[PDB]
Design a protein around this nucleic acid. Structure first.
Ligand SMILES: [Zn+2]
Ligand SMILES: [Zn+2]
Ligand SMILES: [Zn+2]
Ligand SMILES: [Zn+2]
Lengths: 150, 1702
RNA sequence: UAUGUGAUGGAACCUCUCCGGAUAAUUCUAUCUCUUCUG
């Protein structure tokens, strides 16, 4: 549904392989290391190391799409799921949200020292800080959502 | 007033609360810990010292006085007292607050005696001061009868320091006691320094208090008694001493926050960590950063005084190499070993109180932070539970009341707690994740909180209570547990016999589906040793004459050591024992003086003690059972961090612990046994993959889950006896070129274990008494499975290490064969049975071509399930095998006896010969990909070939001479032009020496019998007549040219008389020729229109010259006639010989011999042109001259041709110019021509001393020839002058007339011998490049990489060929390219760039593509399943992006060989064991004597790959023969015989086993499909016709063995051979698809040859001596039979010889 | 650096869950080396 199309359902955060059909290594790289891979046998596969256009060298723009996709699932289809399912969706979203913020905040200090000799140009800072503030908006929503359940 | 000083002396430690602002003095953090010491903070510097307020001391004195007066019925030596009030009041915690201080305990009562009122207060009321009525009064200026001042540190009244410099912060928790998990925690501060212990204050009494002498005496007596009974203040154990009663700033309450003082030199450590990380990423070894971050702490433990870090593995014979980590270059410092020492020395010099331990700790923390910042995915990280600190306090709402029960007896108990098992007390600070807590001076610490918690847990178990203490409730909790812990005092303890740093333990989490670790599963912790002594002190003050029964029961349990004290009790830690128990009882009602003498033993040690019984008790809730397991194979368990510091240099070393009561102890950690038990239970019950959140299954009950605890404790398993280690070597063998890929020698030190001499393991397992039946049955089943031998101990289990219940010699051998079937017959393989011929010599090895189809699978069978028939049936069992040798076998050991010639013994395990399983595994696997057409499991896909440029070959060479530019961008490069140079000559002197250099020997002469010999050749009589002057000349010649010239002049030169010969020759017809206009169009005189007009009458044959002249004069008109005459120069005119022409020639007074040759050259046919006739005459003259010279003098010296007196030689030899040479800037030289100016390439550089144009300069040596002769003896020297003449024939470059090899005189240098048998050198002239105006050209990046590989190739080849270092040709470079290096550049059109860089004109080509993509395109992908991206230069992009686990692996899955045997990520499903012998010492070949093997050399890849377009031939295989007898006979021979083998350093001496010697071994497998089992059985047991090949010296015929399969133990499951055979046939038909060529070739390579008449050898490069001596020689074979183009054949065809027997 | 008719903080185990695993035959023959002068 105009998404990664690898997760079986937001109710059970699983992906039954078949993610290598996508072309972007970023999509494949992330889907293998925070979701259980289903099946009862090990899965071995890969891509052809000839993919052009590079890999964009960043993770944050990718798993940020997980945050919006997971949060909207609760706000649309979260009432039918059980208590264990409700906690799993929110807890997973918080874990991925803070990782991006940690990377962005660490970039902020190392750049705030650099911007002093760059003619106080905050154009790059504004784009990054807005995303950091946008994550903090999701940070408040996630914790508040779980506090209502408990 | 009167002052009575007080003294508070702490014994071990106390607690402190930090500083708070005045507005924040009523918060939760302050009300909690209100009874602790406070911290000061001044305005000037924000620093202060702790102090004790007087209110705590007043409260303690009041409590002690209350107890004393209750115990004595209100009469303490005449001090009659009344109870008081203890109610009302307006006490406040702080003046600027409303917290209110109120009681919570019950006050004691006594009967009232005497009269007490306001006028005459009683001593108790005088101390209390209840009649002052402080209500509604501030009392700031109001006096006080009794006042308590503050208490400060004695001797440190004015000393500031800081909070972090005096105290340390610990986090302490609370345990649920139902599930052993934390619920609440908070923070504390503690002071353990010995200086900050004594506190001194004073009590001030006003004049009103001192009413008279008796009142003051009573007050002093009561105060003294109360001070005696005071026990604890501010959370510590103390005693109070009362002195004699005789005598006469701001806190900065504004807004300010400051914390996180960090530590000194933290920035320096961070910079060091950054530098180390930068170096590691520079050398791309970031996968060892965590290993280094733990190795630094290992160095912390390992001391600096005797430190010796390891080195390389000593490659070649005796030269150590560089360690992969310890020899990392860092900022032009090659040795990290020296860099670390220098950094530590600098740090020690710069800072004070700095030692090795602190530096290592800080560096380890810095590197850990750097690794976590840069190298992510190196560790696991969700921690939801274990948070929410809780502190609660509640002021009472009612009056607590009063009681009437108080203490009457006091007990003191001493003892010792000794750790019989490693312990762990976690230390965690809110602001190296876990570390063992210890004092600041290094002493290990056992806190009192842990002891009290353990005691209350045990007493609650005894009493069967369910108390949780509910933090702060409205009323005291009561109940016996708290009622007894309200009266127990426990002292803080420290280790007495240990102060060294603790060890480090590691744990991992496996992945059940793959059998390997997870992505980031790696944990570490600090662990204390075993044998540490801790003092024990207990104090019980209660109104009973005997100890409570619960305490006696707990002490009985502790005396047996049946409970755990430390944290990690799951893996059997923290077991302590109580010994030397003593006690004493005091009666405070009648023996007050005896008690007060020693203050309960906390001031003076107690004199007399009484022994306590503590009989026994068996009520404890744990059950102990012993476990014994015998291991029947060498045992290895890796300790990667320890192996990086041991000076032995071993790659893998075992784990060891320490014991304080006694040396290294070898063991298997209890964590490993717990993991094995859990895995066995999960596999048996299929619970290894179920989600374990609120599960309550068997696995979640025996071992617990995240939210619960475990019911089992596993202790360590200690080896009993005196174990010994051994060195075991390993290597990886390439499948294309059989032989080690590179220096992959792998070392290990396993404990030697044999079925006859087993290793015994002893350990304990503790299980709770509340475990249900099913869990116990599962545990028993798992223990039985482990004891049966289903799980090996430690690593390397697939190679036969650590096998349980392995006795292969119990079976009565494997006679014949069972379950035998023929794969060749059922698959209709022709096999080409053929017949062999004795008269040919065959190759020792061939190549097997690759297949077409590789069958891969995405999902192999998993490991987490014992049996799941999802797609097919899975079996598991063992196979019995037997091995015997058809030819002698060589398995060298790791120990040798010698220094120059190393002799070797057979492999053995402490005097018992055996065969390792690695060899069998390797050979079986190789045969497996041979059959199933799998991938190449070991393959050097990362390697580029070089080859060598041929001197001549459509252009042979098109390289230009160029020089590097200045210090600009390295891309630019400028062309140049080359000329001759000096600095390489022989001698410089006058012409006399040059003319005397000749005349060594070989002077040509003329003798009379030459004429007689010529007369037999039917030579012309005129030739003899003309040679008679030559006969009588009596002249000796030395050059061929002068002799030929003299012969021509004396006999007669046709060229001298050419004009009249041409004039007298008959002139005939004239015809047009296209070649005339083709080679006459150079001149512009003739127009193209004239050419077209002449071509119009094409192919016009005229009668004679007259007709052609007339046609030329008539057809061509109206133009100048000079071009008409010039056209006649190249016309084709016929030549005819007539008698009249000969007569006219004779009349011209020409020599008669010319006419004689003319007559002998009579030809009826007319010549095409005069030039043809002249060429024929020249050819005849040359033939006659050669025939004459063939009968020259017989000096036998091959008279040299005229070379030496040439002007070129004179100008080259005269100009030495050894000195006056400069290697910088433009040169100053001139072109000194030898009085002849013809063209370029003929000049020299005179170096000053035309236009005088010069630039640059070069300096290098040249090639060294190989020829055996004695010219001038001499020896090597730095003079580099030539001393020699003659030797060998120089091949001519191009030709003036004819191109042919010809002998010439050449200078040479003396042989280096002063095999040191044929050495020479030819260099005569050197090169220099002059500057030219050429635009710089960018250089491709790959050129420098090619140059580095080329330079490494020269260094390796020079080291291999043993050439002298002084005269190494070509001076290269240390690294990169410098702005000014002079190298030859090669340019093509391309994109106006340079692609390749070479140092001289003739060098190694170096390829452009890697070996990984040289497999033929008509063959399926045979690259390894686990791929490497580095085939291109894009691995850096992937590393930066981090997407490395996705681009790996073939996109289709795993090949059958990698599935069955395992890959790096998967685990193998077949295990090969050790092969033993029935007798300890089997018979040895050669009567037990050592065999001197010949020299063995490395395989050369550039023999099946001659050209750049060559493809990989295939796998390499060895044939069977009987060449070992020749090797044995050549050894054991007398030295005088030249056919013997010498004992050089490159040779080796080994021992071999005779034939028909039997060995037995077993193969264990699990989760195998039936087709895999059938194929494995067939591979192990081939047809009786064939045999295997094992061991060393395969090319010499050593190591033919045969394996017989005896039985298959598939377990309870039923198995039949028909199904196995059918499945194997189906799989083979699916794979090969009715293809037999490769199969027939493979079965031809495996045929066994027993005939003694078949000889296989090597071509033995080059052939010497006369006669034939075989066609031996790699060059001569390449010339005629094999050839480079066809060499991709006759090598893939098995059993093909190269030459016949002479 | 404390306020006097009222201090169970000795009123609280940094605890709990995790096989330092997994891959690899101690082996093995064909060249090495660049400037020669018109032959
Ligand atoms: Zn009184
Ligand atoms: Zn209680
Ligand atoms: Zn479970
Ligand atoms: Zn494979």
């Amino acid at each position: 549904s105009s998404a990664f199309s690898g997760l079986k359902i937001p109710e059970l955060s699983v992906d039954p392989a078949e993610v290598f059909k996508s072309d972007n290594p970023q999509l494949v790289s992330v889907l293998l290391d925070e979701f259980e891979l289903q099946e009862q046998r090990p899965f071995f596969s890969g891509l052809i190391p000839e993919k052009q256009i590079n890999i964009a060298l960043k993770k944050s723009p990718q798993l940020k799409k997980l945050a919006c996709h997971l949060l909207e699932a609760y706000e649309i289809n979260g009432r039918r799921w059980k208590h264990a399912d409700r906690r799993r969706v929110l807890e997973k979203a918080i874990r991925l949200l803070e990782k991006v913020s940690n990377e962005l905040k660490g970039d902020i200090q190392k750049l705030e020292n650099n911007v002093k000799e760059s003619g106080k140009d905050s154009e790059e800072l504004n784009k990054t800080r807005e995303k950091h503030g946008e994550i903090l908006a999701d940070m408040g929503r996630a914790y508040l959502h779980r506090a209502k359940i408990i | 007033q009167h002052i009575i000083p007080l003294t508070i002396t702490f014994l071990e430690s106390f607690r402190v609360i930090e500083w708070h602002k005045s507005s924040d003095r009523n918060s939760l953090r302050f009300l909690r810990g209100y009874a602790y010491a406070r911290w000061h903070r001044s305005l000037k510097n924000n620093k202060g010292r702790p102090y004790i307020t007087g209110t705590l001391v007043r409260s303690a004195i009041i409590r002690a006085a209350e107890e004393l007066l209750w115990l004595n019925d209100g009469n303490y030596k005449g001090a009659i007292c009344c109870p008081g009030e203890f109610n009302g009041s307006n006490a406040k915690v702080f003046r600027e607050g409303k917290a209110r201080r109120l009681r919570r305990r019950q006050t004691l009562t006594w009967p009232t005696k005497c009269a007490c009122h306001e006028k005459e207060p009683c001593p108790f009321c005088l101390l209390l001061g209840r009649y002052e009525k402080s209500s509604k009064t501030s009392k700031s200026p109001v006096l006080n009868n009794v006042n308590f001042s503050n208490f400060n540190v004695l001797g440190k009244e004015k000393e500031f320091l800081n909070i972090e410099d005096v105290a340390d912060m610990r986090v302490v928790n609370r345990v649920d006691q139902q599930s052993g998990k934390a619920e609440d925690f908070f923070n504390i501060w503690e002071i353990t320094d010995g200086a900050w212990k004594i506190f001194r204050g004073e009590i001030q009494v006003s004049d009103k208090g001192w009413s008279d002498e008796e009142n003051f005496s009573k007050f002093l007596t009561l105060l003294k008694g109360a001070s005696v009974l005071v026990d604890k203040i501010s959370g510590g154990l103390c005693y109070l001493t009362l002195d004699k009663p005789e005598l006469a700033l701001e806190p900065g309450d504004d807004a300010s926050v400051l914390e996180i003082s960090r530590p000194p030199y933290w920035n320096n450590m961070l910079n060091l960590a950054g530098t180390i990380s930068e170096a590691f990423e520079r050398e791309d070894k970031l996968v060892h950063l965590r290993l280094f971050a733990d190795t630094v702490r290992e160095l912390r433990r390992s001391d600096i005084e005797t430190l010796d870090l390891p080195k390389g593995h000593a490659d070649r014979l005796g030269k150590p190499s560089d360690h992969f980590i310890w020899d990392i270059e860092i900022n032009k410092k090659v040795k990290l070993r020296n860099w670390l020492f220098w950094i530590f020395n600098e740090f020690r010099d710069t800072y004070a109180y700095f030692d090795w331990r602190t530096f290592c700790e800080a560096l380890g923390q810095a590197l850990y932070l750097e690794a976590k910042k840069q190298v992510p995915n190196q560790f696991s990280s969700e921690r939801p539970v274990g948070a929410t600190p809780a502190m609660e306090v509640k002021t009472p709402e009612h009056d607590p009341g009063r009681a009437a029960q108080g203490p009457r007896y006091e007990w003191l108990i001493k003892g010792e707690l000794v750790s019989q098992t490693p312990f762990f007390f976690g230390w965690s600070t809110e602001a190296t994740n876990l570390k063992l807590l210890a004092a600041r001076d290094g002493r290990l610490r056992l806190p009192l909180s842990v002891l009290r918690g353990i005691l209350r847990r045990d007493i609650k178990v005894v009493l069967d209570n369910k108390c949780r203490a509910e933090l702060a409730m409205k009323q005291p909790c009561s109940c016996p547990v708290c009622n007894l812990m309200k009266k127990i005092t426990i002292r803080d303890s420290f280790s007495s016999n240990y102060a060294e740093p603790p060890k480090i333990r590691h744990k991992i989490r496996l992945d059940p589906k793959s059998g390997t670790v997870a992505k980031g599963a790696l944990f570490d912790s600090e662990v204390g040793p075993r044998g540490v002594v801790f003092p024990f002190e207990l104090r019980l003050r209660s109104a009973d004459d005997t100890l409570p029964q619960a305490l006696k029961t707990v002490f009985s349990w502790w005396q047996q050591g049946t409970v755990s004290f430390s944290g990690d009790a799951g893996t059997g830690k923290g077991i302590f024992c109580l010994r030397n128990l003593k006690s004493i009882r005091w009666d405070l009602k009648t023996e007050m003086d005896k008690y007060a003498a020693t203050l309960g033993g906390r001031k003076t040690p107690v004199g007399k003690w009484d022994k306590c019984h503590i009989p026994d008790d068996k009520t404890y809730p744990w059950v102990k059972e012993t476990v014994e397991i015998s291991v029947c194979s060498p045992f290895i368990t890796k300790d990667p961090v320890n192996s990086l510091i041991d000076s032995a240099g071993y790659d893998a070393i075992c784990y060891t612990t320490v014991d304080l009561e006694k040396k290294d102890i070898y063991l298997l950690k209890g964590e490993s046994f717990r993991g094995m038990l859990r895995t066995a239970v999960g596999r048996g019950e299929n619970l290894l993959l179920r989600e374990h959140e609120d599960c309550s299954c068997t696995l979640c009950r025996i071992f617990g889950n995240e939210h619960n605890a475990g019911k089992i404790r596993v202790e360590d398993f200690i080896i009993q006896g005196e174990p010994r280690t051994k060195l075991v070597d390993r290597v990886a063998i390439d499948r294309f070129t059989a032989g080690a890929k590179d220096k992959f020698k792998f070392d290990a030190a396993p404990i030697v274990g044999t079925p006859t001499n087993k290793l015994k393991f002893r350990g304990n397992i503790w299980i709770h008494r509340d475990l249900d039946g099913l869990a116990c049955e599962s545990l028993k089943l798992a223990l039985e499975d482990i004891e049966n031998g289903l799980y090996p101990f430690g690593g390397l289990g697939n190679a036969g290490f650590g096998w349980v219940n392995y006795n292969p010699l119990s079976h009565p051998a494997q006679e014949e064969n069972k379950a035998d079937f023929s794969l060749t017959k059922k698959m209709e393989l022709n096999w080409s049975m053929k017949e062999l011929s004795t008269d040919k010599i065959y190759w020792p090895h061939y190549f097997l071509p690759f297949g077409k189809k590789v069958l891969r699978e995405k999902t192999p069978p998993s490991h987490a399930c014992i049996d799941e028939n999802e797609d097919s049936e899975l079996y598991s069992g063992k196979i019995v095998c037997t091995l015997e040798t058809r030819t002698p076998l060589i398995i060298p050991d790791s120990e040798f006896q010698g220094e120059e010639h190393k002799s070797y013994d057979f492999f053995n395990l402490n005097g018992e010969l055996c065969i390792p399983g690695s060899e069998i595994r390797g050979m079986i696997s190789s045969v497996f990909e041979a059959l199933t057409n799998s991938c190449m499991r070991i393959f050097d896909e990362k390697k580029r070939l070089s080859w060598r440029m041929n001197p001549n070959k459509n252009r042979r060479e098109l390289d230009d001479f160029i020089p590097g530019r200045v210090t600009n961008d390295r891309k630019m490069e400028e062309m140049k032009e080359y000329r001759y140079p000096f600095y390489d000559q022989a001698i410089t002197a006058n012409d006399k020496q040059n003319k005397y250099f000749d005349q060594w020997e070989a002077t040509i002469e003329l003798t009379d019998e030459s004429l007689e010999k010529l007369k037999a050749e039917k030579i012309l009589q005129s030739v003899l007549d003309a040679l008679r002057p030559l006969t009588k000349k009596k002249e000796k010649y030395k050059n061929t040219e002068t002799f030929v010239f003299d012969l021509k002049k004396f006999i007669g030169k046709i060229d001298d008389n050419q004009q009249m010969i041409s004039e007298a020759l008959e002139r005939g017809k004239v015809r047009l020729t296209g070649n005339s206009l083709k080679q006459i169009s150079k001149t512009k005189k003739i127009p193209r229109q004239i050419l077209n007009q002449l071509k119009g009458l094409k192919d016009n044959t005229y009668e004679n010259r007259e007709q052609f002249i007339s046609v030329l004069k008539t057809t061509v008109r109206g133009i100048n006639d000079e071009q008409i005459s010039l056209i006649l120069d190249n016309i084709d005119e016929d030549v005819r010989l007539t008698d009249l022409s000969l007569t006219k020639i004779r009349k011209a007074k020409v020599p008669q011999t010319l006419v004689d040759m003319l007559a002998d050259l009579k030809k009826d046919e007319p010549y095409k042109n005069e030039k043809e006739f002249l060429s024929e005459f020249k050819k005849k003259m040359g033939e006659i001259i050669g025939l004459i010279l063939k009968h020259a003098a017989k000096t036998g010296g091959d008279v040299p041709r005229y070379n030496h007196p040439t002007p070129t030689d004179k100008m080259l030899l005269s100009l030495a110019a050894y000195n006056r040479n400069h290697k910088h800037e433009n040169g100053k030289a001139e072109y000194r021509i030898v009085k002849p100016k013809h063209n370029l390439k003929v000049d020299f550089m005179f170096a000053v001393t035309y236009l005088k144009v010069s630039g640059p300069n070069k300096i290098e040596k040249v090639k060294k020839v190989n020829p055996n002769s004695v010219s001038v003896r001499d020896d090597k020297n730095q003079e580099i002058i030539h001393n020699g003449v003659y030797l060998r024939k120089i091949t001519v470059a191009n030709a003036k007339s004819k191109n042919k090899l010809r002998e010439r005189l050449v200078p040479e240098f003396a042989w280096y011998d002063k095999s040191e048998a044929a050495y020479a050198m030819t260099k005569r002239c050197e090169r220099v490049f002059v500057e030219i105006g050429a635009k710089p050209i960018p250089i491709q990046p790959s050129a420098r990489e090619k140059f580095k590989i080329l330079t490494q190739e020269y260094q390796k080849n020079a080291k291999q060929q043993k050439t002298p270092e002084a005269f190494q040709t070509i001076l290269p470079k240390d690294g990169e390219l410098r702005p000014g290096d002079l190298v030859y550049f090669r340019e093509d059109k391309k994109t106006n760039t340079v692609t390749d860089i070479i140092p001289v004109r003739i060098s190694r080509t170096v390829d452009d593509e890697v070996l990984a993509r040289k497999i033929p395109d008509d063959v399926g992908d045979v690259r390894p399943c686990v791929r490497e991206i580095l085939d291109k230069e894009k691995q850096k992009e992937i590393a930066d992006a981090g997407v490395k686990e996705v681009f790996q692996h073939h996109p289709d899955g795993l090949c059958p060989a990698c599935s069955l045997f395992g890959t790096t990520f998967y685990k193998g499903r077949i295990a090969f064991g050790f092969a033993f012998h029935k007798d300890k010492d089997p018979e040895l070949a050669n009567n037990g004597k050592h065999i001197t093997l010949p020299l063995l050399e490395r395989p050369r890849p550039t023999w099946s790959m001659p050209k750049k377009e060559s493809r990989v031939p295939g796998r390499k295989f060895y044939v069977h023969h009987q060449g070992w007898e020749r090797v044995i006979k050549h050894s054991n021979l007398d030295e005088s015989d030249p056919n013997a083998t010498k004992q050089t350093v490159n040779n080796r001496s080994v021992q071999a086993i005779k034939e028909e010697q039997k060995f037995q071994f077993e193969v264990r497998f699990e989760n195998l499909r039936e087709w895999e089992l059938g194929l494995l059985v067939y591979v192990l047991q081939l047809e009786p016709q064939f045999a295997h090949k094992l061991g060393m010296g395969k090319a010499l015929g050593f190591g033919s063995v045969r394996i017989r399969v005896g039985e298959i133990h598939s377990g309870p499951k039923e198995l039949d051979e028909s199904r196995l055979v059918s499945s194997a046939m189906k799989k083979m038909e699916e794979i090969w698809d009715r293809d037999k060529n490769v199969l027939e070739k493979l079965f031809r390579l495996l045929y066994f040859n027993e005939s003694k008449d078949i000889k296989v050898r090597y071509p033995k490069l080059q052939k010497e001596k006369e006669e034939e001596e075989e066609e031996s020689g790699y060059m001569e074979l390449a010339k005629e039979e094999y050839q480079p183009e066809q060499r991709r054949n006759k090598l893939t065809n098995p059993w093909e010889g190269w030459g016949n027997i002479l």
